[PDB]
């Protein structure tokens, strides 16, 4: 609504557990090497 | 990863023993960020001094568990650093030699100040007191600007 | 303009007794109270752990025209206000040397740009005539020398002299200076008998 | 004495007056905390608070630090910090005035900067070109809620109110015009008593509108002009002459 | 402009009439000034507004200064008492 102030993150948002993203379900053996990290934020941020 | 999402990992063993006490700091932080309206300026600094105190005490709790009395596993302590229950850099300053009672990380940053020097809470008390006794007035430093620190020297 | 601006003149009473000061230059800080025009404000502190921070308030044109400090507004030689300096210069050589003070915010920022050294600063901007008039001040100084009902109070003496003498001759005091009915009243009648006894 | 007890808190922080004042106009301005689309020519009210110089005054935090300046809100009657206030919480005496002497030439007793010329209506802070010591008390008929009170008693109440805020050189109440002229002995007492007794009342409990003193407007303390009384002018000239002789002595001794 | 000058003239006359009546009554209402239309609008009795000094020469002008100051002070006193 136009007259509603933007709701505070710390009260109305942060205490709610998030919901399910897109995440195409991968096969277990045809997609073996990329399955455990394909959908991370930075997929191999710590794998030297 | 302070919010708990799908990317997060489940907790190691000892966390359920120390889950309640950390919970106290959580609810106490949700009194501090709560917008109590104050007209003055010093009374609006008191709120930020309270927040920095609560963050310092939670980090001292996780530090005094893992390093001093060795009461939690290393595998749990890495999780507590990952999930931002602790400040890795402030604990890294606590592990040094001259810095153990350190308030916050803006009181040792030389770049922020006017002329070089750190915050005045880093001075020992007796050195300030002998300079104030030499000039004969009194020691006039009650409480710092950044933290509200009252003498966070290692000897004090 | 500001590519060659003169250094300030800060009174020696204002700078303090510490032999090393740091002062902050802000190239267009405040605007001048006499001159209405921007200048480079300086804000030092006397010792490092003093409580309050002295800052300059007037322009350097406005300070030089009156031959005064910037932090203090006092005459830079004799260390007295402008209004008493002009009285002392006016009382000796009889010129009415009084300083001219401009309203109408165009006129004050007009006057601040001319370079004339305003009224009584012409003498004390030079050490010679400033010492000559002190020599003349020597000559003028040489030619110079429970409730009580008071009555015949001098017409120009205030209440506090009466109270300070009674506190030496040892409350309330209501003195109407017109009718001279000095209705003094002590807090104890024993103190009334005390004051009756001492006189 | 006030050197013994620490300064009492005058009013709590929660019990302070709010901002967003009074609902005068229609729409509230944010950059300036005032009301717009409005009508306003009065905008005055009786101050709820007042200091009691024997009950409230005492030592504070920044008295051990030797601060020169006096608390503005101690004077006005609403200082909400008590023993923690940075500024002084007591009436200016000879010792405190003697320390301010380098700074009173430029700025106030409270530490505020004196402007070049007074105001259209002789407002708040002084002017640094003149050491004025006489205060104009006026608006007394609003200060008394229109209780006509036989003017010698009004002069007695103005005598008693300012007798606690310092030393008095002289008092005068004017018969023809509802005003009084109060000359203090030092300047800092005049500055303190001006900001301490603005927007106050003259009523005191046994006066039948003490429960109803809060309605009204309250009195005005401003700066007095020059006195056209020729006796006052000749007294001023004589006092100027004696000050001139004192400064002649000091300037000769500094050569 | 003709009409406005005549009307401002008669308005000033009425404004002085009421002051003279109150002066006879014994209450001296000072004359209010016109208001400024902008922030640095100049009043012309406060100061000599762009005062230029005549850049002194070789001759001496102290006694003539005193004689002028005497004459002007005496004229102002005479207008105050007797009224021009
Ligand atoms: Zn600290
Ligand atoms: Zn700190
Ligand atoms: Zn600090
Ligand atoms: Zn200037
Ligand atoms: Zn205070």
From Swiss-Prot, chain A:
It is found in: Nucleus. Component of the U4/U6-U5 tri-snRNP complex composed of the U4, U6 and U5 snRNAs and at least PRP3, PRP4, PRP6, PRP8, PRP18, PRP31, PRP38, SNU13, SNU23, SNU66, SNU114, SPP381, SMB1, SMD1, SMD2, SMD3, SMX2, SMX3, LSM2, LSM3, LSM4, LSM5, LSM6, LSM7, LSM8, BRR2 and DIB1. The MPN (JAB/Mov34) domain has structural similarity with deubiquitinating enzymes, but lacks the residues that would bind the catalytic metal ion. Functions as a scaffold that mediates the ordered assembly of spliceosomal proteins and snRNAs. Required for association of BRR2 with the spliceosomal U5 snRNP, and the subsequent assembly of the U4/U6-U5 tri-snRNP complex. Functions as a scaffold that positions spliceosomal U2, U5 and U6 snRNAs at splice sites on pre-mRNA substrates, so that splicing can occur. Interacts with both the 5' and the 3' splice site, as well as the branch region. Has a role in branch site-3' splice site selection. Associates with the branch site-3' splice 3'-exon region. Also has a role in cell cycle. Present with 468 molecules/cell in log phase SD medium. This is Pre-mRNA-splicing factor 8. It comes from Saccharomyces cerevisiae (strain ATCC 204508 / S288c).
UniProtKB/Swiss-Prot annotation, chain B:
It is found in: Nucleus. It comes from the Eukaryota. GO terms for biological process: cellular bud site selection; mRNA splicing, via spliceosome. A motif (Nuclear localization signal) lies at residues 1-10. One of its GO terms (cellular component) is U2 snRNP. Coiled coil: none annotated. InterPro entries: BUD31, BUD31/G10-rel_CS. Its main location: nucleus. Keywords: mRNA processing, mRNA splicing, Nucleus. It holds the Pfam family BUD31. Belongs to the CWC complex (or CEF1-associated complex), a spliceosome sub-complex reminiscent of a late-stage spliceosome composed of the U2, U5 and U6 snRNAs and at least BUD13, BUD31, BRR2, CDC40, CEF1, CLF1, CUS1, CWC2, CWC15, CWC21, CWC22, CWC23, CWC24, CWC25, CWC27, ECM2, HSH155, IST3, ISY1, LEA1, MSL1, NTC20, PRP8, PRP9, PRP11, PRP19, PRP21, PRP22, PRP45, PRP46, SLU7, SMB1, SMD1, SMD2, SMD3, SMX2, SMX3, SNT309, SNU114, SPP2, SYF1, SYF2, RSE1 and YJU2. Present with 1900 molecules/cell in log phase SD medium. Involved in pre-mRNA splicing. Important for bud site selection. Belongs to the BUD31 (G10) family. This is Pre-mRNA-splicing factor BUD31. It comes from Saccharomyces cerevisiae (strain ATCC 204508 / S288c). The lineage of its organism: Eukaryota, Fungi, Dikarya, Ascomycota, Saccharomycotina.
Curated annotation (Swiss-Prot), chain C:
Involved in pre-mRNA splicing. Facilitates the cooperative formation of U2/U6 helix II in association with stem II in the spliceosome. Binds to RNA. This is Pre-mRNA-splicing factor SLT11. Keywords: mRNA processing, mRNA splicing, Nucleus, RNA-binding, Spliceosome. One of its GO terms (biological process) is mRNA splicing, via spliceosome. Its main location: nucleus. The keyword RNA-binding applies. It is found in: Nucleus. The chain holds residues 3 to 266 of 364 of the full protein. Present with 4260 molecules/cell in log phase SD medium. The gene is ECM2.
From Swiss-Prot, chain D:
Keywords: Cell cycle, Metal-binding, mRNA processing, mRNA splicing, Nucleus, Phosphoprotein, RNA-binding, Spliceosome, Zinc, Zinc-finger. Residues 133-226 form the RRM domain. A zinc finger (C3H1-type) spans 65-92. The keyword Kinase does not apply. GO terms for cellular component: Prp19 complex; U2-type catalytic step 1 spliceosome; U2-type catalytic step 2 spliceosome. It comes from the Eukaryota. GO terms for molecular function: pre-mRNA binding; U6 snRNA binding; zinc ion binding. One of its GO terms (biological process) is mRNA cis splicing, via spliceosome. Transmembrane segments: none annotated. It is found in: Nucleus. Present with 2650 molecules/cell in log phase SD medium. The C-terminal RRM domain and the zinc finger motif are necessary for RNA-binding. Belongs to the CWC complex (or CEF1-associated complex), a spliceosome subcomplex composed of the U2, U5 and U6 snRNAs and at least BUD13, BUD31, BRR2, CDC40, CEF1, CLF1, CUS1, CWC2, CWC15, CWC21, CWC22, CWC23, CWC24, CWC25, CWC27, ECM2, HSH155, IST3, ISY1, LEA1, MSL1, NTC20, PRP8, PRP9, PRP11, PRP19, PRP21, PRP22, PRP45, PRP46, SLU7, SMB1, SMD1, SMD2, SMD3, SMX2, SMX3, SNT309, SNU114, SPP2, SYF1, SYF2, RSE1 and YJU2. Interacts with ISY1. Interacts with PRP19. Belongs to the RRM CWC2 family. This is Pre-mRNA-splicing factor CWC2. It comes from Saccharomyces cerevisiae (strain ATCC 204508 / S288c) (Baker's yeast). The chain holds residues 3 to 257 of 339 of the full protein.
């Amino acid at each position: 609504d136009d007259d509603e102030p933007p709701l505070s993150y710390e009260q109305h948002i942060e205490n709610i557990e998030p919901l399910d993203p897109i995440n195409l379900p991968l096969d277990s053996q045809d997609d073996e090497y990329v399955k455990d990290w394909l959908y991370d934020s930075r997929p191999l941020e710590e794998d030297s | 990863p302070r919010i708990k999402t799908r990317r997060s990992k489940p907790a190691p063993d000892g966390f359920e023993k120390i889950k309640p006490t950390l919970t106290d700091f959580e609810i106490q932080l949700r009194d501090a960020q709560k917008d109590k309206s104050s007209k003055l300026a010093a009374k609006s600094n008191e709120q930020l001094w309270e927040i920095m105190q609560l963050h310092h005490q939670r980090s001292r709790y996780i530090y005094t568990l893992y390093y001093k009395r060795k009461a939690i596993s290393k595998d749990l302590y890495d999780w507590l650093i990952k999930e931002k229950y602790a400040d890795k850099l402030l604990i890294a300053k606590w592990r040094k030699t001259g810095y153990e009672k350190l308030c916050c990380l803006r009181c040792i940053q030389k770049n922020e100040t006017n002329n070089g020097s750190t915050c005045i809470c880093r001075v020992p008390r007796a050195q300030l007191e002998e300079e104030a006794r030499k000039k004969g007035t009194q020691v006039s430093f009650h409480q710092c600007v950044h933290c509200g620190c009252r003498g966070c020297a290692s000897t004090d | 303009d500001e590519i060659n601006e003169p250094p300030p003149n800060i009174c020696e009473q204002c700078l303090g007794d510490e032999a090393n000061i740091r002062m902050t230059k802000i190239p267009q800080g405040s605007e001048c109270k006499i001159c209405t025009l921007p200048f480079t404000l300086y804000h030092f502190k006397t010792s490092k752990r003093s409580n309050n921070i002295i800052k300059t308030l007037i322009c350097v044109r406005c300070a030089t025209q009156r031959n005064i400090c910037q932090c203090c507004m006092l005459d830079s030689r004799w260390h007295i206000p402008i209004q008493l300096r002009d009285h002392l210069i006016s009382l000796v050589n009889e010129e009415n040397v009084m300083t001219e003070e401009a309203k109408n915010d165009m006129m004050k920022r007009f006057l601040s740009l001319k370079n004339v050294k305003l009224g009584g600063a012409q003498i004390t901007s030079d050490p010679s005539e400033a010492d000559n008039i002190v020599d003349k001040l020597k000559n003028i100084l040489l030619r110079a020398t429970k409730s009580f009902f008071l009555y015949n109070i001098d017409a120009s003496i205030p209440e506090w002299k009466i109270t300070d003498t009674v506190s030496q001759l040892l409350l309330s005091l209501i003195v109407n200076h017109k009718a001279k009915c000095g209705g003094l009243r002590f807090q104890s009648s024993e103190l009334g008998e005390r004051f009756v006894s001492k006189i | 004495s006030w050197r013994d007890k620490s300064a009492k808190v005058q009013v709590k922080e929660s019990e302070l007056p709010s901002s967003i004042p009074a609902q005068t106009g229609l729409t509230f301005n944010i950059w300036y905390n005032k009301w717009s689309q409005g009508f306003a020519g009065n905008t005055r009210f009786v101050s709820p608070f007042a200091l009691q110089p024997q009950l409230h005054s005492g030592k504070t935090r920044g008295d051990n630090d030797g601060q020169l300046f006096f608390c503005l809100f101690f004077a006005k009657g609403m200082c909400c910090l008590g023993p923690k206030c940075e500024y002084l919480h007591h009436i200016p005496d000879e010792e405190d005035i003697g320390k301010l002497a380098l700074r009173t030439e430029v700025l106030d007793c409270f530490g505020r900067e004196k402007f070049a010329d007074y105001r259209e209506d002789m407002g708040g802070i002084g002017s640094f070109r003149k050491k004025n010591k006489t205060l104009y008390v006026g608006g007394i008929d609003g200060a008394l809620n229109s209780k006509h009170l036989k003017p010698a008693q009004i002069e007695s109440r103005i005598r008693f109110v300012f007798s606690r805020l310092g030393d008095i050189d002289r008092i005068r109440y004017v018969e023809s015009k509802n005003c009084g002229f109060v000359k203090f002995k030092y300047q800092a007492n005049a500055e303190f008593a001006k900001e301490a007794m603005s927007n106050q009342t003259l009523l005191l409990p046994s006066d039948k509108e003490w429960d109803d003193r809060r309605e009204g407007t309250g009195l005005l303390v401003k700066w007095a002009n020059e006195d056209p009384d020729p006796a006052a002018q000749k007294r001023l000239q004589e006092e100027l002459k004696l000050e001139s002789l004192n400064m002649m002595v000091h300037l000769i001794n500094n050569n | 402009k003709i009409r406005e000058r005549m009307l401002e003239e008669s308005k000033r006359i009425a404004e002085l009439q009421k002051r003279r009546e109150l002066k006879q009554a014994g209450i001296n209402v000072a004359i209010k000034k016109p208001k400024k239309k902008y922030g640095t609008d100049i009043d012309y009795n406060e100061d000599i507004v762009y005062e230029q000094a005549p850049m002194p020469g070789i001759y001496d002008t102290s006694t003539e200064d005193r004689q002028i100051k005497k004459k002007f002070e005496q004229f102002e006193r005479k207008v105050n008492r007797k009224g021009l």
